Amino acid sequence: SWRQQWSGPGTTKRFPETVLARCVKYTEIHPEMRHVDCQSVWDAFKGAFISKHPCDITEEDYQPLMKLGTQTVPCNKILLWSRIKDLAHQFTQVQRDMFTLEDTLLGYLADDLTWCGEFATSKINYQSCPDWRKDCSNNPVSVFWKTVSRRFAEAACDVVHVMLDGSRSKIFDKDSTFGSVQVHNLQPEKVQTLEAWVIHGGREDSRDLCQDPTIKELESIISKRNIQFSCKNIYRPDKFLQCVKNPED
């Protein structure tokens, strides 16, 4: 018979098992979250999207999960990123008092995973899930990341650092989660400065990417929020990582 097919990849195999296992692992090494009930976390995560049409998801659907995974890390230890996360995560493994969203319980639970359900039944769809462009933007995955990315970013203070992909057409992309959500929730009451770290790929010919038109575009957004702006090139990721704990030696 007929089964509905979306354009995007389906739910990651073993998603329920993985999400539960991730919660158990996280709470074991983070004594601050040690007594979070991981079954309740999974129940809330699941309840946000199962039995719902996967284009009828709103931010409120994830509010029960958000409450259970409440975690407000030191606001002055936030690292944001856009497009690429590999270096960001490597950085927080070296500078271990720093956090990306994916180093918090909620980000950790969902990073690299895809998920969606269907109307009326409790079945997880492992065949397909809506594509943000071809099907609908209001899908379980896109809506999840939108709501957690805002919460994480809006709480930030002092200097907020963001890693940007300097190999792309738009080094700063206003249509990314950082550009459309996070940058607009930085509060000048708490945030003194946004500092951009532009990551060079292999084809950037050692040029000063802080002079890029999209960086001026980011600078303008930030200045209009009465926040200071700073930009630095990361020419060599491996050299950058080696110098993290001694940047002025």
Pick the closer one to ligand NMN by CB: 55 or 113.
113
If one counts every other C-beta atom within 10 angstroms of the C-beta of residue 179, the result is 20
Residues between 134 and 153 that touch ligand NMN (CB under 6 A): 145, 149
> Hey, what are 106's tokens?
């909620």
Pick the closer one to ligand NMN by CB: 37 or 86.
86
String marking each residue 117-136 x if it binds ligand NMN according to CB under 6 A: --------------------
Residues between 46 and 65 that touch ligand NMN (CB under 6 A): none
The answer to whether 80 and 161 have CB atoms below 8 angstroms apart is yes
Q: Output b/e per residue, 93-119; b: 16+ Cβ within 10 A.
A: eeeeebbbbbbbbbbbbbeeebbbbbe
CA atoms of 39 and 171, how far apart (whole Å): 40
Minimum CB separation of residue 174 from ligand NMN in Å reads 10
Residues between 151 and 180 that touch ligand NMN (CB under 6 A): 176-178
Catalytic site residue from 23, 38, 75, 116: 75
Minimum CB separation of residue 249 from ligand NMN in Å reads 29
The answer to whether 142 and 126 have CB atoms below 8 angstroms apart is no
Minimum CB separation of residue 139 from ligand NMN in Å reads 13
